[PDB]
Amino acid sequence: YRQLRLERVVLVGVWTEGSAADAEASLAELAALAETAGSEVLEGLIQRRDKPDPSTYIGSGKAAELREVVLATGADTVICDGELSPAQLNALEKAVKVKVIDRTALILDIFAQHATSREGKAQVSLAQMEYMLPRLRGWGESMSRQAGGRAGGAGGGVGTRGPGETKIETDRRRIRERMAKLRREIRDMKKIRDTQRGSRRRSEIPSVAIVGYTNAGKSSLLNALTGAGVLVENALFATLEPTTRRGEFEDGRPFVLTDTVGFVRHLPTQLVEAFRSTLEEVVDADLLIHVVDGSDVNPLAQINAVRTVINEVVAEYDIAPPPELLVVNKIDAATGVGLAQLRRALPDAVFVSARTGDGLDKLRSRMGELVESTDATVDVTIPYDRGDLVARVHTDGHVDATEHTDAGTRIKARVPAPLAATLREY
Amino acid sequence: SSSRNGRDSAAQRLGVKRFGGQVVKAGEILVRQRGTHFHPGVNVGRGGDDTLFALAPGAVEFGAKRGRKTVNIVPVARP
RNA sequence: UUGCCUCCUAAAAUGUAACGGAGGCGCCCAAAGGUUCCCUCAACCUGGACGGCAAUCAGGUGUUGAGUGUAAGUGCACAAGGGAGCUUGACUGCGAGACGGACAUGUCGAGCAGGGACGAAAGUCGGGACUAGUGAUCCGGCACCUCUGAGUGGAAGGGGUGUCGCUCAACGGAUAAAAGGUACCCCGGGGAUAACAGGCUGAUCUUCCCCAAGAGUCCAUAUCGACGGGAUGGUUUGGCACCUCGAUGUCGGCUCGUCGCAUCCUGGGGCUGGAGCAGGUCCCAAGGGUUGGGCUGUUCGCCCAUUAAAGCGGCACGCGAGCUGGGUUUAGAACGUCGUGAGACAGUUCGGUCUCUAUCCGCCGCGCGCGUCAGAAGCUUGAGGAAACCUGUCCCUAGUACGAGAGGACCGGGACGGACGAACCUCUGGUAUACCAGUUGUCCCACCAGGGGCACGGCUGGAUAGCCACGUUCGGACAGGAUAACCGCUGAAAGCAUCUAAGCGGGAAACCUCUUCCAAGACCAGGCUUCUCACCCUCUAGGAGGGAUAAGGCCCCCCG
RNA sequence: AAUUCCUUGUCGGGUAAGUUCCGACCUGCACGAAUGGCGUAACGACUUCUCAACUGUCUCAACCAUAGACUCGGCGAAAUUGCACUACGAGUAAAGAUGCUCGUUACGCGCGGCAGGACGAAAAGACCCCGGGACCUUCACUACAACUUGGUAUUGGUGC
RNA sequence: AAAACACAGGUCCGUGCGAAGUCGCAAGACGAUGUAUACGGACUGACGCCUGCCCGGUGCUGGAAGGUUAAGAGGACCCG
RNA sequence: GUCAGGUAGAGAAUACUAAGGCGUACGAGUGAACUAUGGUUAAGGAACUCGGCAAAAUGCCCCCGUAACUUCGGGAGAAG
RNA sequence: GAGUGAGAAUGCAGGCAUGAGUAGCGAUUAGGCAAGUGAGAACCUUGCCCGCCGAAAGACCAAGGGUUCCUGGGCCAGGC
RNA sequence: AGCGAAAGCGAGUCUGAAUAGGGCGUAUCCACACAAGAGUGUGUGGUGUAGUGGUGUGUUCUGGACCCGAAGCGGAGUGAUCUACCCAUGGCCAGGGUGAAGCGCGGGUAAGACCGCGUGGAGGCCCGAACCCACUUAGGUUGAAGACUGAGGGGAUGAGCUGUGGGUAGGGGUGAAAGGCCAAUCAAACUCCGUGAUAGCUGGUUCUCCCCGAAAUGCAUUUAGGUGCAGCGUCGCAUGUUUCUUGCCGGAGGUAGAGCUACUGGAUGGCCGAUGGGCCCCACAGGGUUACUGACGUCAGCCAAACUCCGAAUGCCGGUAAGUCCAAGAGUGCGGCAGUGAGACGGCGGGGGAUAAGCUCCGUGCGUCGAGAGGGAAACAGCCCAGAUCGCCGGCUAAGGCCCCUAAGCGUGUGCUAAGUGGAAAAGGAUGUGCAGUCGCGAAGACAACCAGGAGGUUGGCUUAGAAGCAGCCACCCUUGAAAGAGUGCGUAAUAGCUCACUGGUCAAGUGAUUGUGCGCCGAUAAUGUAGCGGGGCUCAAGCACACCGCCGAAGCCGC
C-alpha cells in the first residue's frame, strides 16, 4: 500500500438514516478514525439527502461550497462518510481538484499501517487490491492519454500484431490472476491457523471470547483479568490478531480468554470475509463477553451492531452460542452520568476505566455460572496407603478441598470424567 | 507532468586569458570576469564589464596588494 | 519546451549534452546616471511613556555576518554600502588593440579633437558594480542634408544621417495571409521507430533464505515467522530499442506432444501441539496419471458431480505451409459520450474470403546399390536403443492394537474394478455397392407368369468373409543389485563421545536388470552350422579383362 | 438497455451447475420524447436464448463405393532458386545457426507419407512512424461560382 | 444482406407560374404539357397513448426610431 | 425467343423412357495413408461446439381439431 | 574523339536450367465387344450390346462468329 | 587607378570641423635617411607592375542534368455493349391453395346495423417450377472459373425478371445511399499530351595500379534520416620547426581530497541554561521546587554538486633548452575537391535510471572497430598483443600457452586444496586444514576415563491438595578446606535414579579463546541433451601461491 501526506482533511456526508444526533455521531466517529489514522479534522458536514446523488455523492451546490471551504482552508483531502462508487468519486474529484477517499479507504489505510503479522498484512493487502480492482477502466489515468497504446489495425492474413485481446482485457486478466493467487493463499493459511490452536479444543476447556466494537476492549480487559500484558491501546483497531491466556477461577480448569479485534459499525464488507480469525474464534467459543462503554452517546447502537454481526455469522456457519452476557465497562472514567439509565435496563454493568480499573469480582462471580457446567460431581474414599492416589484427584484441574479420615481420606471433591472416570473406587 | 527546468544561458567565456610571464600588447583583454576578482594593478585598467585590459606593452604578472589579487604589466626594456 | 540571463550538473583553462537540478527577463531609474565630499552597518547591554524584546536618543561592546532597484553568481566595508552639493558624458567625430568566435551576432577598450559636467587641482564621466531587459533582413513612417534629379529649369521620386513600425515568443525571424479528419485510404521509405515474439536488466513478479520482536492455552523456531537484509527464473506488469516492416500471421479452442521439478496423487523419510483415526510441516523422489460439464471467445475464474489427483511452467504467451475464427484488429451499421463537422471512443452490439502441387533438413515406414575379405543359405547372441511403469473399492488379519470412550490401526495377504495399451474376431454389435429376400415408379425381355436396366446398392429386413469396437484375452508385476532422502553397527583424529575420517549395513513408482519389441551399416560390420568349392580364353604371365558356371537368388506366371 | 465502465448491479425464474437469457428494484458514468419516447398483430436466409423429436456434432469412432492419391503408358507446367557430397545438443554471434567452436550421431540413392524449421513461397507492411499525396470537414487562410445592394450607359417627357 | 436503405403515414420550410429547385456561361429544357388537395427540399418512418419547458448562442422570417459602411456626386486648404 | 410426347405426378419439378442426340477427346490397375462426395451404424441423443455450423428428422392427400395474442385480416398448414 | 569496360537496379529482350519427368490432363453419363481402313487404332469407320439427356445434352430461330458446312487429299503445327 | 550613394576627386578618396583616428588602392621589392619602436611609420632615388584568346582537366549555373522508381496535378478526347438509373417497344412468370369488395335470398330490427346463404378470384397474399438474387456450408482457393460448383436458401403477379434500341461521361454521371458502380481498377475512370513531372526517400552506377586518408563533433535550420559553415581528409601555392614530446621556469583554477569555531545549510549526544507553562500565595504582592521547555553559548564527534577557512595530481597558456629533424610526411594562411554531420564498445569522472540494463546523454592529444588482416581469447568489431609492400620448406619474440587433441614441460623446489573447488555467485552459519600470536592450568604426569561421593535442619522459600533435594523464583562470605549448591540443568506431578559448578588411587599433555593468516563446505536452484574447464581427462595434478629454467607462439623485428 501507499501512504501520502495527511493532516489536512475535510469530511462530507449524507444524513439519510437515523436522526441528526445519529448523523453527528457518525461524523464524530469518522473524525476519530481520521484522527487515529493521522489526520487533523478541519471541517465535516452532512447534507440532509434522501439518497446520495449519482454524480458527486453530494450535489452541485454542496460541491461548490466544499470547493470554497477547502480552498479557504488549504486542504487537499476529502473523505466521504460512506462507500462511494468510481462514478461518484470521479466527479467529486473533478469538482475540487484534490484527492478524495471514503471511510472504507480510511479503514483499509489504518488497518494496513497497524498490521503486525504477515497474515493480517496479506489480508489487508487483498482487501485493498479487491477494492481497487474495479478501477482498471475506472482508473481514468491508467486508461487516458492512451491513443495508440495498442495496435489499432487489421488486415486479411499476416498481421504480426499480437494484442489478441484488448489491453484492458489483459489488465483485467492479470489482476484477476493476482487476486486468485492471493485468495488461494488466504484459504491455504486456514490450515496454518487451525493447526496453531490444534492443541486447543482437543483437551476441551472453557473458552470465553471477549467481543466488542472497536475501542471497547482493545485487550485492556484481557490485561486486567488474565494478568498477561499484551498490546493495549486507547486508539482504534490496535489489536490486529487474537491471543489466549490461562486466566480462570480458583479451579484448576483454565478459562482460555480469546482476544477479539474490534468491529466498527458499517464495515466495508471486505474484511468480514477475509479476516476469519476472530470469526472462527467466536464460532468455537463457549462463552461470550460483550464489552460496552457506559459513557458513550448511544451504547445500544454498538450493542445491536455487534449483535447483528454475530447473528449473521451464526446463521452463516450454522451454530448457536446461547451464553451472551454484556458488561458496560468504562464507568470509572466518570464521563457518563447515564449509569442509572444503563442499569435500569441492563444487568451486569461492572465498571472498569478506559485503560485500567478493578471491580471485576462480581463480573467473575456472575460469569462463572455459564462456564462451570462440568459433570464430574463424584466423591470417593481413598484408602490408608494413598501412594499414587494423587495423580488426577489432586494434581489436576477442577479439584476441591475435602475432609480427612484415618482410613486414607474421604475425598468429597469432584473428579473430571475423562481423566478419572472409574479409576476411583468408593 | 513534466520538468520545470531544462534551459540555461550560453556560458560566457570568462576566465583569465593571458597568464604570467606572457608578453601582452596595449589593450589586450587580460582577464574577463564579473566581480573584481583581479583588481587592476599598474598599466592595467578595469573596463565597463569589470574586465582587465592592458594600458602599455610589456609582460603580464600576477601580484597582490592588501587583501586583493591584481595584475601588473612590467615593461620589456628593449635592448 | 522552443530566445536571453545566473549557479550546479560541468570532471580545478575555455568549451560541454540530457524531456537533469533551482530561478529570473522580455523591466525600472531624468534619478536609483556623472562628478566632489562625507560616513559605516547586522547583533548585544546599560535607560524608559508608550517605544511591545522592538519606534528615538546617548555610552559603548561590535570589523563585515547588514545592504547592494530586479533571479543567482562573481565583487563591493579601501567601499560598488548610506548621506549631501552641483550637473546631464543617458555626447559628437573616432578609436590602436582586442576577447569571443562556423557565419551572422555580442562584449571591453587606452588614447586624440570639439564642446561640456563635476572638482582646490590634479583628476573622473561616450549610462546604470558586472552578467539578461531584447528581433536580423526586406518593405515603408518621421526630421535634417552643402547628394541625385531620365534634354533643360524645377518638382515628384531616389540617396544618405538620425530614428520609428513585428509575443516574426516556433524568438537565425521558410508566407503579409492558413485550422482538422481518414477505420475509404494511396505512394516512397524505416526495425533510424512502435504493437507480437526473440534479446539484455529483474524495478515489479514467483520460490526462498538471513539474526529473530511476538503469536502459538506455558514455549521464538511443531507450525508462523513482523521490522529490515541477501538471491535464484526470466512465466507477469515492466525499462532499452539490438535482428526482423522488399511481412517473424496475433488470443482462445482442437490434434499432437517433448521437457524442469518449484510434487496434486501415487513412492520412500524426520518433526509434530503425531494416543489411534485424522492430519499439519520440511527432505528425497518427474516413472505414470492428473475427469466430465453450465457460464462466458474467453486464458483464468465460479459453480454441479466424482475420483488420488483434477500441479505449476517452458518449448515464437509450442504448434493456423495442421484446422475454427468466438473477439481481437480494416471497409457496413446502430446506441451513450466527445468534436460546430468531417471523424474518435483508449465503451457496448450485429456481420465480416484464413492462400500455397514439400526442394533440403527433420520424423514414421518402405525399398534399391554397395559393404562386412571365395559366393551363398539357415538359426541366433546382443553393443545400442524403443515400448510400457496408473491405481481405487471391498473381505480377512481385526472391531485387533490404540483409545476411559467416542471412534479406530500399521505391516500383511485375498477378491472385484476405473483409465491406458497390445492382440483377436470365438461371443455381441457395426459395416458389407457382384449375397438373399419384400416392394414403389418406369422401360425392356413379343405377351401372362417369371425376370432385367435405372432411380443414393432405388428403397426396405437380414447378410458369410474381411476390417473394426461397443465385444473377448492379456500387461502394469514378484524378484536381484547399486543408490536419493533417512535409519544404524566398530571407531580414532580428540584414552570419552561421534553414522565417517578407513569400513560394514537397511534404504523408494527414481537408476541397471527382470517384461515386450527392434537391433551386427554394433565399421569391433558378430557367433554355430550347411551348400559348389571347381573351370576355360585374352594382354603375355604381372596382375588383371571376359566366358560360361556350382549352391542360391531374381525375372516372368498362379497367388495371400 | 444494440445505451451500464464499475458490473457477472441486487432479488426471482431457466439447468446440477447460467459472465449468455427472461421478470422485477433503480443508486440512468454516458435514456429520452420527430438526431422521435413506450408498446405493437403479422412478417424476418437479422440477433439472442429455452423446449419435443431428430440425428456420428460428440462419448468414439468403424466400415463400404466413387473422384482422388499410388504403380504403369502417354503429353507435360508453375510459384521459388547465391551456392551445396544442406544432421543434432551446448554454446558464440546482427542477441532465434544445416554453413562458426567442443561433443554426440549418421552407409550411398530414392519411394510413400506428417508439416517443426529453412525467421518457407506470394505480395518493396494495409498496422506504427517519417516525407509526399489524395479526398472530406470548418466559426483555418486566400480566392472564385452563385445570390444580393448601390452607382453608372441603354434611360426618355409635363407638373410640384 | 442486416438493426442499414427504401417504404406507405406524419411535421416543417420554400415555390403564385417560361413558380421554387435543377441542368445550362447563356438560350433552352425537366419541373409540368402539372398550378398550393400541386411541386421541390429537410427530418421521422405503419397503427395506439403522446412530442414536456426554453429564442439564451447560431440559423430563418419581418421591422420602424436610430449608429457603422464601397463606388459618385463632391471642389475648402496645401503643394508642383 | 418457338416447339414441350408416354407413363405415376397437380404439376414445364421429380424417375424411367419415345423420336432425336451423345458416352465430350488422356486410359489400365490398384480394398495404402489422407482429402472431396455420398451411404450405413450398436447404446445415450447436442454431453462437441462460440453457436444444433453441418448432418439428421417432419415433408404428400384426405378427415377431425386448432391456443394466448390480434389492426378481427391473421396467428394457422398453428399445435395435436 | 567516345554510346569506352556490369555482378547486382525485385533491371530489359533472347535461350535455358532445378521444382520434374512431379502436379495436371478441365466433373456430378460408362463404356464394351466383333469386323474393317491403317504398318502403326482404346478414342477412326461399320455392326451388335450397355449407359446418359430427353421443358433436353433433342429440334428451329435472333444477335453473335464468317466459310468452320460438304466433296476430295495430309498428319510436321493445334486436340492437354 | 581607386574612393563614395552621388555630385566629385584622384594616387588619393570617404568618413570627416580636423594638416587627426580610421576604411579602401597606390603589384611587389632594393637603398637612404627623419620620429618611434604602442607593435613602426613618413617620406626620397632605382627594380619596376601581367592580362587576355583558344585548349584539357575538376567543380558549379540554366537546360532532363548520373540512371530507375511513385502516388497524384492539369489540357484534349473514349467509354452507359459490364454495372446504376431512366426512356420507347416486345416477351416471360408451370402448378396447387386462401377467400375483399360487389352482387340476390332469408333471420333481424318501425326502419338501420349485423348474421349467414351462393357467384367473385384481388392481394406489393401462401407453397412451389422456369427465371432473378446470393443467406449457410463443403469444395475450389498456381482452381474448371481473374469470383465458380455441390447441397440446401429468398422472391417467384410484381417496388417483378428479361430482350431489343436509345439517354445520362469524369470534379461529371448514376446511385432504395454501400464512398456503391461507371468495361475485371473508382475517396474522382480510361488513352494521349505537359512528361524524361517530382521526389530531403529506396535501389543501381561497370577496368587496374600507386600515394595520402577521415568523421559520425559544434553551431543554425518548418530542422532532427536532410542541408550551410566550422573541425577532420586531400592537391597546389608560401611560411620551414613556428607542430609535437620532454626538462626547467612564470602563471590562474577550485575539481579529487579535506574541514566546519571559517560563511551557508542538516544533524549525533552532554554541560550552565534564562526565555514560557504547571503548581505556584491563585494577589497580577510575593519565594522557586521544575522528569516540561530551556535560546545564545560551550565539550566531543560528523555530513553537503548548487558551503568552502583550505586544497592537490593531471590538464591548460606562455618563456627558455633540447629531442625527433635523408620526417613527424608536423603547424599555420589562401585556394581546387569532397565525404562526414545515425556512431559503437572498452577504462576513467559523471548525469538519467533502481548509482539495473549489450540502456541513454556527456568530458577524456584515452584505446579499438568504424575504415583493420594476423595470434590469444571456443567460436565472437570494439578485450590483450599487434598496424599485413610481396616471396622464402629461416630465426627471436609480444599476449597466451606447454598431458591428448594442439606446438611447446605428464618442468625443478617449498606449502595448500578433498571440494573436481579448480572449472559461476550473495546475505549466514559452521570442532576442515595451512600456516601468527595468546590463556590459567602445565611432562607435579596435566586433562579425559575407572572410580568410595545418594536428601546438612535439605518435604523451608511464594506456602499448608504436597510445595515432598526437585514447576519456578530473587543467595550460593557456607568445609577435618577432601571432589557437590536451602541440589541448579538430565529426571520425580510423588519417591527413585545420575549427571552438572566439581574428585583422591591407575599417572600415560594437552586446555580455552584470537589472527581465522590461504585455501575449503554448503548457501547453489528450469525447462531439446552432459551444458557454468573446449572436451577427454586431471589431485600419482594436467588445480592454487611463490621462486628459477627453458620452449611454442603472428602477417611484429631480424635474415635473403
Curated annotation (Swiss-Prot), chain B:
GO terms for molecular function: structural constituent of ribosome. One of its GO terms (cellular component) is cytosolic large ribosomal subunit. The keyword Cell cycle does not apply. The keyword Ribosomal protein applies. Keywords: Ribonucleoprotein, Ribosomal protein. SUPFAM superfamilies: Ribosomal L27 protein-like (SSF110324). One of its GO terms (biological process) is translation. PROSITE patterns: RIBOSOMAL_L27. PANTHER family: LARGE RIBOSOMAL SUBUNIT PROTEIN BL27M, RIBOSOMAL PROTEIN L27. Belongs to the bacterial ribosomal protein bL27 family. This is Large ribosomal subunit protein bL27. The gene is rpmA.
